[PDB]
């Protein structure tokens, strides 16, 4: 007797009017977030400092899942019950999950014009 049903887990799609900030991301693995910090074009002095961790590690302001759950459902990106979610594989990202893990970045952007 299994189901093999997901960890609670429910698309999403980005924010209206929403852009990118000076908030960075951090893990415990460099490279994960490095990686990230680099599709968005993180540039210093970064306003803030969210953290991520590996699941069942859910205590980083943002959280991942493992590459096994990416359904098309989850196309324009996913969140958790309440935390928002990324695809890891073997703690980092590649070519494959990248291309996904820019739109939970979209969804991170927060809603402020640069109308200067």
């Given at each position: 007797?299994?189901?093999?049903?997901?960890?609670?887990?429910?698309?999403?799609q980005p924010l209206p009017n929403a852009s990118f900030d000076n908030f960075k991301?951090?893990?415990?693995?460099?490279?994960?977030?490095?990686?990230?910090?680099?599709?968005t074009g993180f540039t210093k002095p970064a306003s803030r400092?969210?953290?991520?961790?590996?699941?069942?590690?859910?205590?980083?302001?943002?959280?991942?899942?493992?590459?096994?759950?990416?359904?098309?459902?989850?196309?324009?990106?996913?969140?958790?019950?309440?935390?928002?979610?990324?695809?890891?594989?073997?703690?980092?990202?590649?070519?494959?999950?990248?291309?996904?893990?820019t739109?939970?970045l979209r969804c991170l952007w927060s809603t402020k014009p640069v109308d200067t």
């Amino acid at each position: 007797m299994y189901t093999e049903q997901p960890i609670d887990l429910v698309p999403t799609q980005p924010l209206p009017n929403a852009s990118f900030d000076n908030f960075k991301l951090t893990c415990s693995n460099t490279k994960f977030a490095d990686d990230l910090n680099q599709m968005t074009g993180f540039t210093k002095p970064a306003s803030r400092e969210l953290s991520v961790t590996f699941f069942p590690d859910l205590n980083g302001d943002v959280v991942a899942i493992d590459y096994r759950h990416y359904s098309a459902s989850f196309k324009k990106g996913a969140k958790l019950l309440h935390k928002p979610i990324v695809w890891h594989i073997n703690q980092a990202t590649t070519k494959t999950t990248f291309k996904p893990n820019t739109w939970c970045l979209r969804c991170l952007w927060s809603t402020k014009p640069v109308d200067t």
